[PDB]
Design a protein around this nucleic acid. Structure first.
Ligand SMILES: Nc1nc2c(ncn2[C@@H]2O[C@H](COP(=O)(O)OP(=O)(O)OP(=O)(O)O)[C@@H](O)[C@H]2O)c(=O)[nH]1
Ligand SMILES: [Mg+2]
Ligand SMILES: [Mg+2]
Ligand SMILES: [Mg+2]
Ligand SMILES: [Mg+2]
Ligand SMILES: [Mg+2]
Ligand SMILES: [Mg+2]
Ligand SMILES: [Mg+2]
Ligand SMILES: [Mg+2]
Ligand SMILES: [Mg+2]
Ligand SMILES: [Mg+2]
Ligand SMILES: [Mg+2]
Lengths: 41, 137, 327, 95, 95, 52
RNA sequence: CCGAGCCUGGUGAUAGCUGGUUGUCCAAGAUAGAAUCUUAGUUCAACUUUAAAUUUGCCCACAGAACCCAAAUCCCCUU
RNA sequence: GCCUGUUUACCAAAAACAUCACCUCUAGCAUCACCAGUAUUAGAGGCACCGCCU
RNA sequence: UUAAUUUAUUAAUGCAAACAACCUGCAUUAAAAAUUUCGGUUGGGGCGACCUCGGAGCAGAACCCAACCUCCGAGCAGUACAUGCUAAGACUUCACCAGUCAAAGCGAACCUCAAUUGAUCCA
């Protein structure tokens, strides 16, 4: 039971992982863009 | 038990004679309401930092006043240079102002006659000292 | 045996004579909390940080000074307010939003008045503060910050990393060195249009507060005694380095007439005799009047200006003297 | 150590040795590297890998440990799934 | 009653042998003082009417102080033993 | 100064590793290799281990 | 024979300190450091001794060992 | 150092210790000391007779 | 003794226990004491300084060595988040402890420089 709970939790996290990584990288890039926009003023 | 422990603090931990304790109770009844620990701190403030001996602490009703006022005025004078704690020999470069001149007098009289400073500066110092006490605690 | 108490004894026995009735107020101000100013990082989101500080109810003493003077922004609380600025935090641009530094420490740089594109020297100023203010100013023709202490050089480097962008610091715009200012006259002469000489001093407030490495400790008696000679040598080196017609500002974090006015006068005399170079002390009385509303000044000063620490404005102590090298 | 106990007259074992070292029947003593659990955040990966290893002891160290432990710890132990069963004996050793 | 416990475990003595104690086995820690336990109640069977407790032959949980100081000494109550319970049961069923 | 913080795998595994970040800086989210999942995954700062 | 009496016992107290440590004869046998409440001591190393296994040990020809800007040393085939 | 006295038996007899006098602190009290006593009392201690000026 | 550790003992109080006091248990506060210690270098004394690590005088040229001394610095910071796992063979501060470099391989992509530190036990 514990083994399958761990496996299914890992499966759900992995399923969410690509979208989460894409969102995180997009957030970093947009923060960088906002910094450049502030520099432009 | 409250009365007995107040008296025992005044006698054993403050080394006030029996007659001195009776006179303290007669002149400053608020000491009874005042909690232990705070009273000892007030007495030791008078004794060590201010260099006031038991006869003077009793003659001038020092325990009547509040610790906040005592610390405010005394530390203000000390940092101004007017007051100076007696050395190991019990001597000071300049005679210290009288306890009556510090505590008994009103705020304006204390600031003019003794401190010779401005009420604005005194208020700033009071706020600063309150903040310092809060940080220390 | 507290070196703090030693410093108190010395400061009493000297400054009481020096200032008469002002010594009690100066003493209480020095022994009380120090009022801090927030110099907004011009490289960071300066406008946003200034708005946040104004919401925190501070005001730009530099801005109000420039208002009646007829590029720096440091916010300070009103007279009598003891409020503390919130600790500075990194901004969006990866640099700290503002620097918490003594407001009076900014006056030397403001008096130096860096013209657009001036080559600048900081002979021994490496505690941060004035150096960062100079960087935020328009000294785009390079700034040479020298100190004799690698520890303070490392601290300066860390603050520059935190505040000044690497793009600004990469070029020769900033040159940080761990050398001796006295040798600096020989190393470079008639080079810098603007020079700031913040000599080591008694640092009255720090000596009174910090026990560690207190200048008034017994073990450092020789250094304390020779301090005037070292300060004169450093100021002479800075005056030698500055270009003819160039401006220097000698700054000291102490009340000592000996360490401020006699130091500047001895530097002038030594430079005019040994090296035959004339220097004229500029008039900072207009500066005093302009900045009086925020800082309390010792009216009885011969050469230079002296911000004295008051309770209503615990920004001192800070002596600064402006000197133009006529020859 | 105690060369003759007061109750049995036997030689005693320093249990501090048992709690720290493994003896291979061949005569080698294995140990962990000191500080392998300390402040790993400031240690490089190579240093951590070096610290995480099981290490043999000197000849003099092994002699000291043999003296400090009794014969019971120097016997053949046929444990079921001992990870060190292969290491309990030497092979192709010349002198 | 004060209940104590050895700090140091005593080695097993055997079956017929007696444990051999030493200086360290005389060191104790107080596990519990029974006098500080919460009060319980004593079961009694009343023999005479008593105010605010009962009338006669009814089991009553009374404070131990009351049971041992007034009721039992004065005979107003008897212990709730099986024999007394049986006897008062016959009394009730005969009444 | 800097603080040592425990970045925890967001892949659901109990994997964790310690990093250093400025106290004043915002909490940390970081791609890191997860040996259990055998893949780079996000890690999020959970708690401050110590201050250094 | 008192800054803590005397006697007995624990007690053969402990002492990194002082002193002592008894037949004959032969043989090998000398200054490198490190840690240590450690420098009056000890543990490791080095050196020394004994026994055993094996094969290379020493001396050393060329060649070779850094820029910043003497004497020699290491390494080393032969012998 | 007030005095007469006391002291390191066995290297110090003193300016040291005590001492009347004065001063400080503590205690409102019975059947074993204090005491078969009771604040002009008892205990703890300082100093050193007395006498003066402030 | 304002050195460390204790309150075993007395005196108080507080809470339980028991029916105000006494006694017992547990706490707190004092008095009284009890056990134990008083590191190293710097002719002594005072005030100081120093004790670990890195660099120079400094071995002229493999390594190591000039202690005491003259000094100058470090008790980090920055980047990165594969700064992951493994593994031949080597170096090593003259011991050990510890500290270094690293082929190949798996898996990925296609550290920095003087010192910047601390064992066991135990949490
Ligand atoms: N590894 C490690 N052990 C510690 C540390 N602090 C204390 N210890 C352990 O505890 C011992 C020191 O005890 P204490 O000096 O009383 O420690 P403390 O933290 O000052 O105080 P307590 O918590 O009251 O023990 C060490 O020898 C270790 O066993 C620490 O920072 N690191
Ligand atoms: Mg048996
Ligand atoms: Mg005798
Ligand atoms: Mg012996
Ligand atoms: Mg021979
Ligand atoms: Mg010794
Ligand atoms: Mg006499
Ligand atoms: Mg006589
Ligand atoms: Mg006698
Ligand atoms: Mg005699
Ligand atoms: Mg005689
Ligand atoms: Mg080695």
């Amino acid at each position: 039971q514990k083994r399958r709970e761990r496996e299914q939790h890992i499966a759900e996290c992995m399923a969410k992982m690509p979208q989460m990584i894409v969102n995180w990288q997009q957030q970093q890039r947009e923060n960088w863009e906002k910094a450049q926009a502030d520099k432009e003023r | 038990q409250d009365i007995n422990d107040t008296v025992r603090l005044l006698k054993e931990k403050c080394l006030f004679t029996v007659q001195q304790v009776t006179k303290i109770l007669h002149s400053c009844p608020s000491v009874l309401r005042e909690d232990l620990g705070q009273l000892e701190y007030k007495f030791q403030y008078a004794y060590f930092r201010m260099g006031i001996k038991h006869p003077d602490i009793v003659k001038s009703e020092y325990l009547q006043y509040s610790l906040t006022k005592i610390k405010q005025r005394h530390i203000y004078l000390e940092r101004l240079g007017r007051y100076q704690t007696p050395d190991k020999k019990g001597q000071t470069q300049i005679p210290n102002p009288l306890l009556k001149d510090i505590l008994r007098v009103s705020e304006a009289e204390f600031l003019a006659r003794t401190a010779c400073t401005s009420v604005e500066e005194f208020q700033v110092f009071k706020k600063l000292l309150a903040r310092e006490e809060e940080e220390s605690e | 045996f507290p070196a703090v108490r030693l410093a108190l004894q010395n400061f009493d026995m000297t400054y009481s004579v020096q200032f008469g009735d002002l010594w009690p107020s100066i003493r209480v101000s020095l022994l009380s909390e120090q009022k801090y100013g927030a110099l907004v990082n011009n490289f960071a989101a300066w406008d946003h940080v200034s708005a946040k500080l104004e919401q925190l109810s501070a005001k730009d003493f530099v801005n109000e000074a420039i208002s009646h003077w007829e590029n720096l922004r440091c916010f300070t609380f009103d007279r009598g307010d003891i409020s503390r600025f919130p600790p500075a935090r990194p901004g969006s641009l990866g640099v700290m939003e503002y620097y918490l530094m003594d407001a009076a420490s900014l006056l030397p740089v403001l008096a130096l008045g860096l013209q657009p594109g001036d080559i600048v020297l900081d002979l021994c100023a490496a505690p941060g503060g004035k150096t960062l203010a100079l960087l935020q100013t328009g000294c785009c023709r390079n700034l040479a910050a020298n100190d004799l202490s690698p520890s303070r050089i490392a601290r300066l480097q860390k603050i520059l990393h935190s505040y000044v962008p690497e793009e600004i610091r990469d070029g020769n715009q900033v040159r940080v060195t761990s050398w001796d200012g006295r040798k600096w006259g020989e190393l470079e002469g008639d080079t810098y249009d603007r020079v700031l000489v913040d000599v080591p001093c008694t640092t009255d407030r720090h000596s009174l507060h910090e026990e560690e490495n207190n200048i008034f400790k017994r073990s450092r008696k020789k250094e304390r005694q020779i301090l005037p000679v070292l300060q004169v040598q450093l100021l002479a080196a800075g005056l030698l380095a500055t270009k003819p017609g160039g401006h220097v500002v000698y700054s000291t974090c102490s009340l000592s007439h000996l360490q401020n006015e006699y130091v500047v006068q001895g530097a002038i005399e030594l430079l005019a005799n040994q090296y035959s170079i004339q220097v004229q002390v500029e008039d900072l009385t207009h500066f005093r009047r302009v900045f009086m509303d925020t800082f309390c000044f010792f009216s009885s000063c011969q050469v230079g200006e002296l911000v004295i620490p008051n309770l209503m404005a615990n920004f001192g102590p800070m002596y600064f003297c402006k000197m133009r090298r006529l020859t | 150590l105690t060369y003759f106990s007061a109750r049995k007259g036997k030689r005693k074992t320093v249990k501090a040795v048992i709690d720290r070292f493994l003896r291979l029947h061949c005569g080698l003593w294995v140990r962990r590297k000191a500080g392998y659990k300390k402040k790993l955040w400031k240690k490089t990966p190579a240093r951590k890998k070096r610290l995480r290893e099981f290490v043999f002891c000197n000849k003099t160290q092994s002699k000291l440990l043999d003296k400090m432990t009794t014969s019971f710890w120097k016997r053949r132990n046929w444990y079921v799934d001992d990870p060190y069963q292969k290491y309990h004996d030497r092979t192709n050793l010349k002198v | 009653t004060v209940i104590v416990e050895r700090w140091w475990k005593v080695p097993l003595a055997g079956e017929g042998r007696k444990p051999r104690l030493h200086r360290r086995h005389r060191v104790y820690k107080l596990v519990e003082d029974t006098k500080h336990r919460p009060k319980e109640n004593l079961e009694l069977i009343l023999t005479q009417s008593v105010e605010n407790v009962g009338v006669r032959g009814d089991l009553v949980s009374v404070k131990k102080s009351l049971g041992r100081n007034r009721l039992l000494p004065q005979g107003l109550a008897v212990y709730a033993s099986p024999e007394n319970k049986k006897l008062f049961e016959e009394e009730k069923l005969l009444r | 100064k800097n603080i040592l913080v425990r970045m925890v795998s967001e892949a659901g595994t109990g994997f964790c590793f310690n990093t250093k970040r400025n106290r004043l800086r915002e909490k940390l989210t970081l791609l890191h290799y997860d040996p259990v999942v055998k893949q780079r995954v996000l890690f999020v700062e959970k708690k401050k281990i110590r201050s250094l």
